[PDB]
Amino acid sequence: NDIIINKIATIKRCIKRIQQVYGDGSQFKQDFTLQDSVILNLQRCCEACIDIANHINRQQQLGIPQSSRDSFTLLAQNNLITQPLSDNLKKMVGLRNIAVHDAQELNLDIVVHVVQHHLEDFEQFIDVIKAE
Amino acid sequence: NDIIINKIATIKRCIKRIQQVYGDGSQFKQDFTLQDSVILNLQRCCEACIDIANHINRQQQLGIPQSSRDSFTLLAQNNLITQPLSDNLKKMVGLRNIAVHDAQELNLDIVVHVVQHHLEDFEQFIDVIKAE
Amino acid sequence: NDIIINKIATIKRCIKRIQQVYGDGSQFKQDFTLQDSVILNLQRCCEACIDIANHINRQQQLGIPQSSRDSFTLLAQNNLITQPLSDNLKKMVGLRNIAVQELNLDIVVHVVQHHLEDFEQFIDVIKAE
Amino acid sequence: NDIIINKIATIKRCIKRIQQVYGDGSQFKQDFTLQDSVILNLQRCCEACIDIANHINRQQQLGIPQSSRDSFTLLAQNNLITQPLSDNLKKMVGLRNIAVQELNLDIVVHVVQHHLEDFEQFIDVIKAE
Amino acid sequence: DIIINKIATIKRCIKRIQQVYGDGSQFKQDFTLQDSVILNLQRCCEACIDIANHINRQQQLGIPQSSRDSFTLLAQNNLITQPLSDNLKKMVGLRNIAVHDLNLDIVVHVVQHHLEDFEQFIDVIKAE
Amino acid sequence: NDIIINKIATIKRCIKRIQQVYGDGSQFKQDFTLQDSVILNLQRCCEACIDIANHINRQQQLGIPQSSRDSFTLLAQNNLITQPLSDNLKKMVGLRNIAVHDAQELNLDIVVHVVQHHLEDFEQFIDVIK
Amino acid sequence: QLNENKIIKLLRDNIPKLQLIYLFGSYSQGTQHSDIDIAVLAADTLDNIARWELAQKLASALDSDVDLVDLRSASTVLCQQVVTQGKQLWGTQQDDELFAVKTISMYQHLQAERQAIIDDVMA
Amino acid sequence: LNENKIIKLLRDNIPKLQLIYLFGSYSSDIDIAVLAADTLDNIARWELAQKLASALDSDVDLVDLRSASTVLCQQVVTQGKQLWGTQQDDELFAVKTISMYQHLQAERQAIIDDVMA
């Protein structure tokens, strides 16, 4: 569907922007502007994923998502994403929430860990959805 | 009261960071990283204002917001902010709505216009609450 | 559920506006504008309750009410409200035809003084779901 | 007949109090008790018109009205009110709902400024009798 | 002109009640004098209603649903005090009982203590 | 019917009342007390007459009159009253209105022309209802 | 159909020294689409709040809105309507006829008093 | 409900119409939501409601989704029956609505919790 094609494109665009902005990491913990760019592009990835989840749930009538988190749990209980990936996406939403709404309690090492090891959670989500 | 001060402080920190990153405006439109920082700090200002507004709504029991923009309408209907300022903040919520739910159909000329002429709407909204 | 949350809010807002406008009485029976406000806010309370009742009747599949009073009769027969509260809510349905006069203004003062707690008791039962 | 004479009296009384309470649009803006007064007296006007219509439909044996709106169509189909005034009276039927309120307040103001005459027109057509 | 002639009738009818009900030695015993007082009380009662109906009429205060409503309409617009409204409606009820069907300790009581209400009503009305 | 028999006794009681108070009539036209009496007892007869008219108009389902005239008119229009007696009593309640509500334009001649020749009118209505 | 037996019973069980019950609304003429209009006469006037309460009691029992009129305190205009269009459901014929002529007489007197007022507002 | 009457009446009166939803009890009032390229004049929308009211012999509530609250947009997306418009526009409107609603629930949950004891 056309909507999922554009959300997957947005996720693609944002991942590289994260990559391209985080470069080697030598300046990320230092510069507020590279933290802002990385954090804002993680949010967009999260929202594009949430919108895919909300779109599938509505149009195949698996339920009404109360929140962004349950939108991924309903996809998991109908076995269209693996449980492990559901919880990773659910925990990425929560890190963004701390990252955008309360950055002075944000552990940037978590963001660096997510940047280095967890961006394929998004890409694993895209490979599942796309392999419908 | 504890939560309001922190939000107020967050708005000031975010305002300053927008100004420092937007500097003179020259390279803003040609570098996606500055855009990201400014856009993400604008969202922070809007969300912090909504949190201040909803917290007042809750402590004085003025109603249940039907949309994000309505949090400011309830402050205006009880005469705690002037409605010219209510509509400015509501317009800012709609731009957050655009920047969040639709990454790329932001028109950055609106974004720079907000930076140049409408950031004091945040400080007026913040200029009214404190004294209450 | 948004429908029940907003109807409970509408009931609370009207109950407060009734109390604020009626005050100690005093000037109430001599200003037709304060009588109109109280009377119209009482109707708002009754309709919001009827809407809550019909929404519960439908989502809990208790039956189809044929009338405004049947909305409360279905809740009482399934023991989600007591019969005394059911009969009090039905009484207020009668208030709709009191807008459309001083023979009635003591009916309104009677309702203001003795039956607004029936609205607050109904929403307390609904909040406890 | 006393039924129509008293309904015409209430419509006149309600139109007066709407005009008296609304004024020049003064502070009707942010004071919920005068909007409530205006809204409820517009309701009273609508109900009185429906009752006049039903009394004529039944006195003149034009049919049994199936709805509040069908009450005015029966008069319109027998040419005792013209079609535009019938449709104007029908769109007043819708008013009793938005009692149950701020961008709907422009609706109320719209009716106060442009549709009061519709009630007036209806009672002078009935005063033919 | 209607109100001034009605007030004239009330004044000459009251004076006629007073003259014929003298000391009241026989009011209770002879009926022709009961007849005169009762009809002139009725005339006083009727004339107040016409004054009231003429005022309601000239100021569009409402449509009386009953004779008592004539005085209720003046009181609800602050043209008579409600104590005076309730007294005049008390006389309307006695006119009703006289006309349609009267224990006469009631008429002796009104004659001796309640004519002032007729005279207060005309003193108000003319004052406006 | 008890309502009929009670009115009819009222009519007969008030006619005799009229006749006794105005025995000779020497001092009738300058003592207006005996005429407060005769005017009062005159409209009790009229009042009473109107009540059977009203009572019969309702029981026989001929309509509910809104004026005392229409009451006598409906009984004539259904042929239970002779029609000039309908006018003879319609004219009597009309004499009574002027008698009680406008007591200075009261000819006072018709007063005595009616206790004269038209007081029987009450009592043909009275036997016509029996 | 309207259940006139439960109307009678309910009013008898609740109104002391009841004398007349009338059905007189649209339901008395042809039960059109509506209040059920009911008039009662008792030896005393009823407390107005108590009368509204019994109206809602009948309303619950008949599953429709009910207007209960106490003829001892009702207007002449509304008494005339009850005798004109009303259907007696209880009480003696004597009490009904007494009420009728008292009402009808009072109404023709009120029409004389108020005619000029009526004429002006409908012309 | 004659849905065709609803469809026609709103097509003939609303410029650049994009979606029509029947929602509420019928999928009191027939509840109908429309989305056009512009927001509609509030008074014009009420008057168009009464025209539908006359033609359907019933009360009608006409909701303009471009100016309606998030709460009520969510209700139209959850319970509404589409009567007109493309499948793409419906899915676009749903994704925007549903997302905004989950954001609004985060902002206001403390308020709803306090009002529901």
Author numbering:
A (entry chain B), B (entry chain C): 2 to 133
C (entry chain I), D (entry chain D): 2 to 101, 105 to 133
E (entry chain H): 3 to 103, 107 to 133
F (entry chain G): 2 to 131
G (entry chain F): 3 to 35, 38 to 127
H (entry chain A): 4 to 30, 38 to 127
Question: What do the authors report?
Answer:
Our subsequent work demonstrated that the HEPN protein with a RX4–6H motif is the toxin which cleaves mRNA in vitro in the HEPN/MNT (SO_3166/SO_3165) TA pair in the model psychrotrophic bacterium Shewanella oneidensis. Furthermore, antitoxin SO_3165 binds to toxin SO_3166 at a rare 2:6 ratio to form a hetero-octamer, and this binding is important for the antitoxin to block the toxicity of the toxin. Specifically, structural and biochemical studies of the HepT/MntA TA pair (SO_3166/SO_3165) in S. oneidensis show that the GSX10DXD motif of antitoxin MntA is responsible for transferring three AMPs to HepT and that Y104 in RX4HXY in HepT is the site that receives three AMPs from MntA. We found here that MntA antitoxin acts as an adenylyltransferase and catalyzes the transfer of three AMP moieties onto toxin HepT to block its toxicity, representing a new type of interaction between the toxin and the antitoxin.
The results clearly show that substitution of the Y104 residue of HepT prevents adenylylation by MntA. We determined the crystal structures of HepT/MntA and HepTY104A/MntA at 3.08 and 2.6 Å, respectively. In contrast, this additional electron density map was no longer present in the HepTY104A/MntA complex. Comparison of the polyadenylylated HepT and unmodified HepTY104A revealed that they were nearly identical with an RMSD of 0.396 Å over the 953 Cα main chain, except for the loop containing Y104, which was rotated clockwise nearly 180°. The MntA molecule in HepT/MntA was almost identical to its counterpart in HepTY104A/MntA, with a maximal root mean square deviation (RMSD) of 0.26 Å over 98 Cα and 0.29396 Cα, respectively. Although substitution of Y104 in the RX4HXY motif did not affect the toxicity of HepT, this substitution clearly reduced the ability of MntA to neutralize HepT.
